[PDB]
Design a protein around this nucleic acid. Structure first.
Lengths: 144, 43, 60, 185, 37
RNA sequence: UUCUGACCUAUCAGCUUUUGAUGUUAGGGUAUUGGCCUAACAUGGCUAUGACGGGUAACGGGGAAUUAGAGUUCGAUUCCGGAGAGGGAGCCUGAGAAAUAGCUACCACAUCUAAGGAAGGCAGCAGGCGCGUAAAUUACCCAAUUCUAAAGAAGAGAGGUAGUGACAAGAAAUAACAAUGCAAGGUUUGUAUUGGAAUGGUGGGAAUUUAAAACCUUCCCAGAGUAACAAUUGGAGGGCAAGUCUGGUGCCAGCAGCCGCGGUAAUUCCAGCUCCAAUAGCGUAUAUUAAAAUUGUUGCAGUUAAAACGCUCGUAGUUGA
């Protein structure tokens, strides 16, 4: 009493009420609506190959003061322009004018990361060579 | 400008070699030795 | 031998006569015992030469 | 087609890793039982938990229920075969009474150390690993081998080992022999 | 906002005023629709 | 051919019916029932229990992942059943095919041409191109497993065997021990200098295994002290286990799931040192379950935090002294 129907033959109400009310969940909407397969430029891949269009220096969100060196990349896979982060300070300096990048997601399932403003992707390999190795120097030598 | 400014600190710092290192224990030996170092007299 | 040896397990067969050995034993096993090496060694190149023929144009 | 043989994971991870008191308890278990990995604890724990889950299912099922009494007698009989339950313990509530040290004690390295064939759990582990132990005339290389009730007193040295009374033949021992022989010659 | 109206905490400008701006805006848009069609 | 069982969608509510929709009759057709097809005659039939459309990154099941109990997600992908063989379509042959290494034609492709003409179809096995975030050899064999024939004795890229394989899964090294020095305990136990014992991997030969080769195992030779026969991956403010450790940068460079660190003495950046976690594995992304009694049958909430239809009647609905 004072709640959901107890009735034996009331499964119909419980199913319809549940079915309709399910949609307000955020994860359920993204997964069960078509927008997933549409609006994501990675289109259900973790990873994508693109080419660097522009090197840009984005200023950090209000609590911090700092310019984050980033790369505007055009995906070859779907022909889409994205802005991607490049980890490693001198690695951006190493990276070339129209570099071929293997870009990934950024640890947050299409949501924003830290003080970066809508930059939802990060480049993790360039010209088939590893970003970590480029950052290291003990590990694998730069490309020719 | 900010394009110039990029990559400073790693290049800037005066790097030092990692010099002479003795090899560590592995495995069961390393864990047992660690257990003894922490927990025997010092537990 | 099995792990740590000192034991060897196998399988043996002893036939009634030499005619039985010829009759009911496998050719590789007869070779392994002692018999001549296998005939017509060529894989599928045999098939390739075989399939070419049209109605007694040539035997070869 | 694919191979039709089955396979299964050895363990379940203990989650929430930096529970200090739990972590240090595992280190004490490693220290005691001559183990190489937390995974060793976790596999023996997983086996114990599988047993505990079975024992819970049986004791939750009714008295005199045919499957339950059969499977229960079979389980206890197996505990007797393993020697995991001994003489003084003989019902499903003693299976619930079973503990992770009791299972760990079943390891061959523990038995070798206990019998005093080797001087320590690690020395026992290496003695087994160097193929120098044998259980009932079977050479064995596995220190984690879980002994049955009968086999505990059937543990002695591998026959073709030095400790078996056969040849050492070692590079050292042979080198000394060559040195003596060259000296004499 | 949500479907539910007003709820001035600290909030912003007046909800009735936001509503006035949108009602006026919708009419303006309706005039753009009229221009179109 | 009977019964029973579906994901999402109402910003899809009336559909179906001259072109058989639904019935009746008569025939024809079929392998046989059958609007299966033709004629004649009826005017029905299906629809909130969501019909009819539309979506689906939708082959179906046995099942898989996570499951305390519910559940939730997932099921090309070893078996069973279906579908398809460039697109559509049509036949022939035969008991069985609307076959596809059967045929014919059209469209989409496309090869040789002697310029008249002619022939071609990998979503069989390799291998290649393109696509891409992403995936192996034109290897050897019919010995087993089975299949087909004029059925033993022959065939079979079915099937087996290797090669490439850190997809996963299991087992499992990277020391052990005695001397000394130190430590604590007053004549004991524990542990950083030394130095003699034990050993696989590794290199070679066999026995053996095999279609053959290779692996396994087993034996015989060889054979470690820096046991160079070289443990890595990521951390040490908090969440969260270990440093107010040593230098450098100076709100810059930068890092860091999140909070944050950085404006000169940085416990977070760049090095170095020590320490810690897991370990031959550990990072990273994306998707997914738990987390979430944060979708709630079990098991939610609605005075003030989000949420009682303005109100009442009322058919279906659900509930019924």
């Amino acid at each position: 009493g004072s709640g959901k129907p107890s009735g034996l033959r009331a499964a119909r109400k419980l199913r319809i009420r549940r079915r309709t009310q399910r949609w307000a969940d955020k994860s359920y909407k993204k997964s069960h609506l078509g927008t997933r397969w549409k609006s994501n430029p990675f289109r259900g891949s973790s990873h994508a190959k693109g080419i660097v269009v522009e090197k840009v220096a984005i200023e950090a969100k209000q609590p911090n003061s700092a310019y984050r060196k980033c790369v505007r990349v055009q995906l070859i896979k779907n022909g889409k322009k994205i802005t991607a982060f490049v980890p490693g300070d001198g690695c951006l300096n190493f990276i070339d004018e129209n570099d071929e990048v293997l870009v990934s997601g950024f640890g947050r399932s299409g949501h924003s990361v830290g003080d970066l403003p809508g930059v939802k992707f990060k480049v993790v390999k360039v010209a088939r060579v590893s970003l970590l190795a480029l950052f290291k120097e003990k590990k694998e030598k730069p490309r020719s | 400008g900010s394009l110039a400014r990029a990559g400073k600190v790693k290049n800037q710092t005066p790097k030092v070699p990692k010099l002479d290192k003795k090899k560590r224990l592995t495995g069961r030996a390393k864990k047992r030795q660690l257990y003894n170092r922490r927990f025997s007299d010092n537990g | 031998t099995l792990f740590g040896g000192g034991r060897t397990k196998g399988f043996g067969l002893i036939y009634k006569n030499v005619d039985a050995v010829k009759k009911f034993e496998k050719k590789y096993r007869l070779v392994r015992e002692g018999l001549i090496d296998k005939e017509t060694k060529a894989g599928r190149r045999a098939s390739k030469e075989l399939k070419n023929r049209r109605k007694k144009v040539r035997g070869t | 087609p694919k191979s039709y043989r089955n396979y299964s994971k050895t363990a379940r991870n203990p989650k929430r890793p930096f529970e200090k008191e739990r972590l240090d308890q595992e280190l004490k278990l490693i220290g005691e039982y001559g183990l190489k990995n937390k995974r060793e604890i976790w596999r023996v724990q997983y086996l114990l938990a599988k047993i505990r889950s079975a024992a819970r299912y049986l004791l939750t099922l009714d008295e005199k229920s045919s499957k339950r009494i059969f499977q229960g007698e079979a389980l206890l009989r197996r505990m007797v075969r393993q020697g995991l339950l001994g003489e003084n313990e003989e019902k499903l509530d003693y299976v619930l009474g079973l503990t992770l040290p009791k299972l760990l004690e079943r390891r061959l390295q523990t038995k070798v150390f206990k019998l005093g064939l080797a001087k320590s759990v690690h020395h026992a582990r290496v003695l087994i690993r160097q193929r120098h132990i044998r259980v009932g005339k079977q050479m064995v290389d596995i220190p984690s081998f879980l002994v049955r009730v009968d086999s505990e007193k059937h543990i002695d040295f591998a026959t073709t080992s030095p400790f078996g009374g056969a040849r050492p033949g070692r590079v050292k021992r042979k080198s000394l022999k060559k040195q003596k022989e060259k000296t004499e010659a | 906002h949500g479907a539910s109206r007003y709820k001035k905490s600290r909030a912003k400008m007046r909800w009735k005023w936001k509503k006035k701006r949108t009602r006026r805006l919708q009419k303006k848009r309706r005039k753009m629709r009229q221009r179109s069609r």
